[model samples]
Target: GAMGMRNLDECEVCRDGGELFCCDTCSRVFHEDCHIPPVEAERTPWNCIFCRMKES
Candidate 1:
């Protein structure tokens, strides 16, 4: 969705203010494992930007 937030990398995963982790897949950096969570280990592409993020 073009209306989606800025590319995660373009985002400040650092949460420069609050809490959040950057997504790993799309380089959409997140706060950390805390902000997000571990991916359900699998090879199939989840297609979720978050899942992608967790992988790498």
Candidate 2:
């Protein structure tokens, strides 16, 4: 078989988070309306708060 792209929803965060904007790298949940300050508001592309905490 030939190579192909994967579905965007395949991301862990997107698959189970019940949201499109969820971070695949992290599981930080964000609401399109309230996702302010990103990270919460700015959509800072968070993978997971837990991971960030671990890295820190």
Candidate 3:
């Protein structure tokens, strides 16, 4: 069953965090340290590596 877009509760890498970065494109989420190019701010929009890859 194809589910709708939704953010995960935990980080995709570490699987834990008091805070998480949700990908603007996918369901996967990430922590500050767990993300490849660490997230800059919580207020700004962010995209995961998988989503960024599609841009190029």
lDDT against the true structure, each candidate: 0.39, 0.38, 0.42
Off by over 4 Å in 3: 1-34, 41-46
How much is the lDDT of residue 23 in candidate 2? 45
TM-score of each: 0.18, 0.22, 0.26
Tell me the deviation in Å of residue 20 in model 2. Answer: 9.6
lDDT of 2 by residue, 1-56 (tens): 13322343445544454333334433323333222223545443434443454564
Count of clashes in candidate 2: 13
Comparing 1 and 2 on lDDT, the stronger one:
1
Which prediction has the highest lDDT against the true structure? Answer: 3
Model 3, 1-56: lDDT tens digits are 14443333344644543333345434333333325544556433443454555585
- Candidate achieving higher TM-score, 1 or 2: 2
Candidate that beats the other on lDDT, 1 or 3, i.e. the better one: 3
Residue range 1-56, candidate 1, lDDT tens digits = 34344343443543453233233433233324423432355423333445544565
